[PDB]
Symmetry: D2
């Protein structure tokens, strides 16, 4: 019962319970949504994490680079939600960039093969997912992906920033396609969230200066966010995704909502 009551919503992107997609799933369920989850490699792992969601959700394997996964995905989803039932909501919370595309590995040293894979998973998959899923979405539906504002360059994020810029562009095109279905497509630009991966990088897994830069990045974010930014709390982000999954932003599409504390609106 609540914001998303009665809505059926596929949430990709759970890998640990500190995944942003975990909290989107959690908040969505608290808000009445019925979910279908997708999970990339470690399905036993993800099933076990998602057990802690306030409700059961069928989990489906989706490797966004796997053409057959995508080819089969809408059938598997209507299996999970039942025939004559369509999705109202799709959450893309998938992202990856090989280590060479990030951190201390010099920007120019990331091999295109690595960059392409990251763009595949992080950008192009937003379109793949919309292609697989728009056929099984209701008018009034809503696709949401997870963005990290790439409008300016920053240390360490390197090719993942480039991947996010591609994503923003994809999302504008997905909006165009989604529009034919009465469906909105939008990104949520989140502030830095202390995801397991993020904590690794902060603690030096991608090099000390990268880890140092990201820590400075985090602190500056909260400093300039007029409402502050708490990187340890994904809930404001999860709620924002739910905001877009709902009927309360019905004239917004091709767009980016900044759940970033307002940090992007402030220079210092």
């Amino acid at each position: 019962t609540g914001l998303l009551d009665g809505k059926r919503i596929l949430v990709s992107g759970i890998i640990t319970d500190s995944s942003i997609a975990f909290h989107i799933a959690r908040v969505a369920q608290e808000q009445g949504a019925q979910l279908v989850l997708t999970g990339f490699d470690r399905l036993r792992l993800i099933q076990r994490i998602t057990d802690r969601l306030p409700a059961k959700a069928p989990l489906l394997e989706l490797d966004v680079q796997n053409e057959e996964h995508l080819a089969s995905l809408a059938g598997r989803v209507t299996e999970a939600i039942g025939a004559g039932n369509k999705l109202d909501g799709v959450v893309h919370a998938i992202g990856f960039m090989p280590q060479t595309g990030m951190g201390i590995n010099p920007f120019f040293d990331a091999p295109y093969a690595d960059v392409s894979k990251g763009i595949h998973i992080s950008a192009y998959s937003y379109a793949s997912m919309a292609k697989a899923l728009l056929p099984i979405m209701n008018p009034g539906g809503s696709i949401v992906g997870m963005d990290f504002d790439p409008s300016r360059a920053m240390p360490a994020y390197n090719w993942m920033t480039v991947a996010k810029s591609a994503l923003e562009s994809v999302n504008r095109f997905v909006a165009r396609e989604a529009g034919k279905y009465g469906v909105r497509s939008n990104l949520v630009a989140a502030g830095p969230i202390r995801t397991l991966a993020m904590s690794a990088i902060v603690g030096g897994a991608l090099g000390e200066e990268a880890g140092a830069q990201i820590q400075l990045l985090e602190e500056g974010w909260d400093q300039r966010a007029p409402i502050g930014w708490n990187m340890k709390d994904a809930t404001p982000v999860a709620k924002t995704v739910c905001a877009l999954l709902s009927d309360w932003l019905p004239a917004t599409t091709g767009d980016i909502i900044y759940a970033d504390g307002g940090a992007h609106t402030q220079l210092l």
Copy 2:
């Protein structure tokens, strides 16, 4: 009962029942909000329009250019909502630009006195209102103003576009001040809505070519909006304002939400 349940919200900007602020008020009430309304010149008129709101709301006179109105405004509001009661929400839906700052009057011919008055009412008043009202707002509160995307120049809107650019800038500063109160400040960038004024301009009240350009503007908007744009329906806008007035965009401030059909994300 609903999105705004229990929230106390001042809504400025009702002048006719096709005022965008009428529908924000309507939707807000449908959603559980308790309102205080403010009304500019024709208070008998506005009282009579707002009678059609699904609930009663105290109406208070506010001329945003009247220092005493603003000086007295928070007292009058706690009178209306009761002592020890604070606002959760503030809607700025005020805008005006003298005729010389718009339409067929050449851009260079608008006298500064006229432009200044328009900027006063349309931009600076967003700050005035936040100054008067932040003292009587709860943490978690939300100020919302009404924007018309001025990031590119357009025919006929002339100095009102300039006034909107000023407003976007003001809002970023208001966010900074509002943040000290745990309060968000944001604009909703709406698509063209057929307000009484808009219909006048379309029908030539500001000159035929202006009226012609705005009609083209309207049609192009709906053409490029991937979800379409219905200028006769302010509801998607009103809902978007409610989205921001709620707890569902809690990490967004200093910001602009585009309730414009997605038209701004598309070139053609």
Copy 3:
């Protein structure tokens, strides 16, 4: 002889020899331009400063708030450059915001009268100047104003940022008018330059925290500028204005060139 050879160019905005407009004038003359200068209040003062320009330039009084100054300005300019001679170039380097609109004076405490005056001089005057001068500009001509990127809020700059946002908007409209003359209109967004006024603010003239914030602002600018930023050197800015005054950016109008070290393209 050089970039601006043969071009006749009005340069407003000289008040001291550390005025950005001093260096634009200097570089423009080094580059072959013939100048007409305008000067606001202290004409004896400005004449004496401009004596150090590599060439003579007629100086003309222009108070951008003085309707008669503007009304008479094009006659005075053709007097200065000779009948049947038209301007190729116009440099708006004028800006002012009362102290209440800046620094430590709380944002909400700037009286509209003060803000309006600042917007008058800093934003609306860009249009006034184009109105006075477009009648006496050649096809292929170029108007340039001085911008400080107001796309995000910052400490201390307060209402001057708002004034800059208005200016960016004005410039897009001026481009539209200027286009009818074969004339481009553009802003140069400069990095912080240690102008006499700036040095005052840094040293606390507008309050210690403002002065502190602006110093941090300056340092962060140079830190994130991939090519660095030297606030003590206005030459890169002056050259950029000359770039726009020339024939080398002939397809650019309504636009903003960032002579800011690239600082705006970088987050950290």
Copy 4:
């Protein structure tokens, strides 16, 4: 002799004499630059076209997807310009997107392999080129790539728009690397230019509706460009690239210059 006098400048991207890079090369030579050209597949063809350049230029093979081409590229260039001679300028004018990523082929139907190749050539190659060439560039140097404003989605350009968004992002990162060399990196966002490829698409080579949309795109561009836009003339673009290759935009990097008639600053 002129703007680029004495500058040594590698210009990629000539394939026909209506290549934008042909005209950049032409204008650069008219302006005193000494060039080294690179050419992708049809080297006999390109040699024969470039014979019409006002001066000789060594032509070097560069397939931007060929790691060995890039690995060897700086040696070949110092061979061509002579030992102890460094580049002042680099022009990236390379772009390609497989047909499936464009026009009438539905956006969702472009296979990632196709999109990746386009992003490789159109975006990632900007970084490859800067990596190969920054070692042989002088302080004060300038890399320039060719952009088509992808900030909003448009018909037919599909994945090439996405590729341009990636490019804008790459360029911000290249600026960071280039900065260590005293080198600027910037894009020129050009208006639609009637290149041979463009004419094909207009005449239906990628589908009739795509061809129709691009024609509408072209016409709207010139309509909203306050100075007009002539798609048949690449010279304003070529001059703009030269503007960036010169010393006249010395404080600009990570940036985008819009040689688009001012069309992007205008809504209608």
